Symmetry: D2
Subunit: 198 residues, 4 copies
């Protein structure tokens, strides 16, 4: 049975880039709901799978992907941020970025665009294509998880649902984007990245 | 473990409206594949559900809905057709049609339109809305099953994937539509309908 | 040339159900942006259409549906609300609601459910089905407009994008839905309904 | 005014890989229909655009993408094939394939997989990513065109709508994919590729 992971920091450990109220609601309410509903959906599915009830299985897919995705996406997002974040990555990760996107700067401009380009709710991602052996940027709608729906390995995600910035940045998503770069835990992204090299 | 149901008639029992080659390929190859792939997907899912692997569960959804839907949809379609079909329904079913669509004729014109209106692969359906307590026509893309994705109870389905008519009607889907009315097993639809009244 | 319509009342006219900050931002920022991007996209589409550039036309569809839908939806929304609204509709609208949903309360629960059920951004609608000649509830994703994507004529819409309630209700979408019933302009809903008897 | 382009060879020029009946039907019937509906839809769109009818514009999008995409896709497809084709591409295209996919064989398996993997109707494509400056494989549903919906520049397309192979290969899509490699016009694929170095 899935559970809500604790934050590697305090609700206000990302200020002023992301005020405490956001982190609090985002973690304790939003993520909590996705976890809670994920467990319920899984149980219902197990029961449906046991009876060989295809219609019931299919009818549960939306709730599974949404809440399951929500759980996956936010769990990663918490580790992608840190009071000790900011700046630029070093070593291989940095070399890969310049390699695949030209420069760290162009990389940012690309991920920012993918993130700002989401119409409605969704996420912007920097992932790893194991097949092509290189980095790849992609956007996902609502809570659709990167790996489950694209196959790409999530390295860094940027939540662009309005609940991720509205209380502080209101309608100006671009400001949120520019600010979040200050709390990116490149240490964790590098770990996720290095895990792909193999 | 799901299995491929036998036809309530012979592969050529629907001629000339639907030649034997179609019925043969459609049942033994197409439906068979959906069943075969459905069992495999379910097993993989059970294993994924056992480990609490959300990404794996989500990644399997497409195959589940497609093959599961394929199994559901074709199983119904076989019972919706019959060498003893054709003509018009009688009793309550017929009264419901005139009630909800005006006349049996307008009903046909409506279901034919929904069926011909499908861009790409899909199905046209005459279903029952338990909530509204009346008949409702709807179209579904690819193998997405009616009940699992809309909640409507399937009463009559019209396969409009090209494999359902190309060998005989080629690109003229309208001809297939006009012809299939001759083999509709209204006896079975009435049964499905009466099961909804409760 | 499309234009941002003036609200039929002041930003604080809907207090305390929907506060002034939300109304001001929702109208002067959100709707304003949809209007300009709609105009720009229409102009770009005219140029593509004149040159017969099918690829350019198709590439513009997302922005056209998103911004055009955004304009259509919010224009209707403002008229659906009023400081002198709330309670139950008078006249035939109420009778149509009783007939198609059982009662006003059941209707309220169904539209609330449809609205709360939107995963991600979207809208909940009470619409009119011209074909069936009766009321029908539907939910639309992001800014996809009701009539243009479903054929249903919009009567009452409930915006469930997080920007419609976050500054006031936070994550509690249900409290927002509960409060909005207090400001529904049934006079406007009835006008939209009566125009469908055509 | 869009027009049905003449094939660069006779209907039987691709035998026995793709027979004459399929080529004749695919071109004179399928593509012909997409062309006329594209023209009609464009004209209807101009009228809606002139009146600023956003709902009408949005309602026309499905037909525009479907028929416009159908025209774009088949126009490219015909040029991608040749009686004098098959084998491996010569020049830089082959080197780009080796670089981005490892080898020609691996590339063939990937495009075959992407094509066979389409659930329902669609297309498999080898495209060029201008941003990343490299080759990329993608699959598109129904008639959604590659460039207009993904930004990738189409180099080689494989039609996997059942009408592209049913009269000859029946349900065995894999045999169709195997046979088509024998008629690929690499000269055309290379031209499309070289135009991307711009
Ligand atoms: Mn979030
Ligand atoms: Mn079928
Ligand atoms: Mn809004
Ligand atoms: Mn085709």
């Amino acid at each position: 049975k899935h559970s809500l992971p604790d934050l590697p920091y305090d609700y206000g450990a990302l200020e002023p880039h992301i005020n405490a109220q956001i982190m609090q609601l985002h973690h304790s309410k939003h993520h909590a709901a996705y976890v809670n509903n994920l467990n319920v959906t899984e149980e219902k599915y197990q029961e449906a799978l046991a009876k060989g009830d295809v219609t019931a299985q299919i009818a549960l897919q939306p709730a599974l992907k949404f809440n399951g995705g929500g759980h996956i996406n936010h769990s990663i997002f918490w580790t992608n941020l840190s009071p000790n974040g900011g700046g630029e990555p070093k070593g291989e990760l940095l070399e890969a970025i310049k390699r695949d996107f030209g420069s760290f700067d162009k990389f940012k401009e690309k991920l920012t665009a993918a993130s700002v380009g989401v119409q409605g709710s969704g996420w912007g991602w920097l992932g790893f294509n194991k097949e092509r052996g290189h980095l790849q940027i992609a956007a996902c709608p609502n809570q659709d998880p990167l790996q489950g729906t694209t196959g790409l390995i999530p390295l860094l995600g940027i939540d662009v649902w309005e609940h991720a910035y509205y209380l502080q940045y209101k309608n100006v998503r671009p400001d949120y984007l520019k600010a979040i770069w200050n709390v990116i835990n490149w240490e964790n992204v590098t770990e996720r990245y290095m895990a792909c090299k193999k």
